[PDB]
Swiss-Prot record:
The keyword Nucleus does not apply. Monomeric. One of its GO terms (cellular component) is extracellular exosome. The modification Phosphoserine is found at residue 3. It is an enzyme of class 1 (oxidoreductase). It is found in: Cytoplasm, Sarcoplasm. Its EC number is 1.7.-.-, 1.11.1.-. InterPro entries: Globin, Globin-like_sf, Myoglobin. One of its GO terms (molecular function) is nitrite reductase activity. This is Myoglobin.
Length: 152
């Protein structure tokens, strides 16, 4: 639904992220667990992490964070043509994990916040606008996909 130029802005940031997938990954997750602790319960496995440092220190978490961004990155470089990629994600989050759409709104926030913190000079209004939109297209697609699975 985005213009060619918005894609480029999106992808232009994405390239910075990609220079430190793991580091972004951790800030991203950690912010989420921090701004909305409830999301933390969906992780049977990270739920025992009581502090920031402890989160910062977890190999597992960090690993998990590369996984999330890898997948996310894969969709974004499809510039809207991402059915293939999107489908498998929706099935499990809908089926296995049960992540409500609100939860996606939360991670979406966490994303934009980390990028803005790390990449100011590359993350202005238009570029921040472009990323938002991108995150909305993904979330929209995901939601339809959820219903079709009989989730929401
Ligand atoms: C950008 C949005 C998201 C993307 C790209 C994403 C991506 C992934 C990927 C690629 C996996 C690996 C295998 C799987 O599909 O089960 C995963 C697993 C998982 N995701 Fe997400 N995720 C996102 C958002 C979330 C959110 C917001 C939550 C909960 C608040 C969540 C909960 C989980 C959990 C619990 C698992 C399995 C963890 C494990 O391996 O133990 N996901 N996610």
């Amino acid at each position: 639904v985005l213009s060619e130029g918005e894609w480029q802005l999106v992808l232009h940031v994405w390239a910075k992220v990609e220079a430190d997938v793991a580091g972004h990954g951790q800030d991203i997750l950690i912010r989420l667990f921090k701004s909305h602790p409830e999301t933390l319960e969906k992780f049977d496995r990270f739920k025992h992490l009581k502090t920031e440092a402890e989160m910062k220190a977890s190999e597992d978490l960090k690993k998990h964070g590369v996984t999330v961004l890898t997948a996310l990155g894969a969709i974004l470089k499809k510039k809207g043509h991402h059915e293939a990629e999107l489908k498998p994600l929706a099935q499990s989050h809908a089926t296995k994990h049960k992540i409500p759409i609100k939860y996606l709104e939360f991670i979406s926030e966490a994303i934009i916040h980390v990028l803005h913190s790390r990449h100011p000079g590359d993350f202005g209004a238009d570029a921040q606008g472009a990323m938002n939109k991108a995150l909305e297209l993904f979330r929209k697609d995901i939601a339809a996909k959820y219903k079709e699975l009989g989730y929401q």
